Amino acid sequence: SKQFIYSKRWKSIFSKIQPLQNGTTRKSYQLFRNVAKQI
Amino acid sequence: AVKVALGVAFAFWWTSGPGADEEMDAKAQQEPDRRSQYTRHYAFKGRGRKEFLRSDMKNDANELVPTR
């Protein structure tokens, strides 16, 4: 004859924490983001 | 005995080609020599200075040791 599922808990966790409010958490985020984008 | 006779006998025929002097003029007319191998050198005196070519530099390994 003739769709991406996301996680509620992990999304809430990663939205809860903020970078960018100071240089310390910003630099931690930068270092992790560099290595994570690489590998 | 046979070999050193036949090789010289063939050399007599093969060396006796026609003209035989225009190619002397053709070879000697290029008094600029064959192009010689390039090296990095100093401008004033031409002593060689070290190169960083990748196909040679990729084999090199060094280490660090304490001094006495």
Added chain:
Amino acid sequence: YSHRHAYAEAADAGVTVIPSQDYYGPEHDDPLNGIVFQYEAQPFSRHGWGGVPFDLTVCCEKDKTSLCLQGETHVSLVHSVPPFGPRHITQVTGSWEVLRPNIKDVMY
């Protein structure tokens, strides 16, 4: 004159020396005239984790008539390596040429 080039070692001081020879030497003597010094180091390291690879090379010939002085230095600076980035390296080279009394100008 082979007894002049047999000497005690000293073993190690950091630098290396080679003698430098000319194409036409004197008739009844040895042809070597100058000395080339070579040094190589890695200064700003913490505990063998280095910073700034560095090396230097100087050729010197001094007598009462002429003076030859050539020199070269290289400094390498590494910005990133994987997985912290891509491999990103810069290099600075300097060189100088002095040849008295033939030229009376120096080359940089």
